[PDB]
Design a protein around this nucleic acid. Sequence first.
RNA 1: UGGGGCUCGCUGGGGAUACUGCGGGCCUUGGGACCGGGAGAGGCCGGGGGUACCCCCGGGGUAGGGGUGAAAUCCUAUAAUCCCG
Length: 65
Amino acid sequence: QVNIKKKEKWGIAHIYSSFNNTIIHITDITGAETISRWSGGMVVKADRDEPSPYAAMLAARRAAE
RNA sequence: UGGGGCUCGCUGGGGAUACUGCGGGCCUUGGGACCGGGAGAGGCCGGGGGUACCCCCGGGGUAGGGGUGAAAUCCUAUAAUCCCG
């Protein structure tokens, strides 16, 4: 780590929004580094719940840690 | 018996001159024509920019994705989707 002056980091979060699935994907402000990728069909077992809001909160909570 | 009409498509002579024909002359209401201002996804030609989709290459990043009412065939593990260049 080369000295940080601000002591705050920023991660732009791309949100790709389908009626077949939801994808949440937060990267660094450049976009050149992928910390974490989590979708709505690892959370669940079935295709119907692949989208919805409830996958699209839980997917966006695992990343967030 | 006497009078009329008859396809009724023909002809000769005289007469009228609105209309029509023809001939001549004359005029701008129609038409055409010109000049100047003017809008438009009219046509053609040359020039040039950006969107998004796809594709290909490098990096980053893992367990999926695709698809449906459910599914399967099919995409992806020499790495897909995704994100960055």
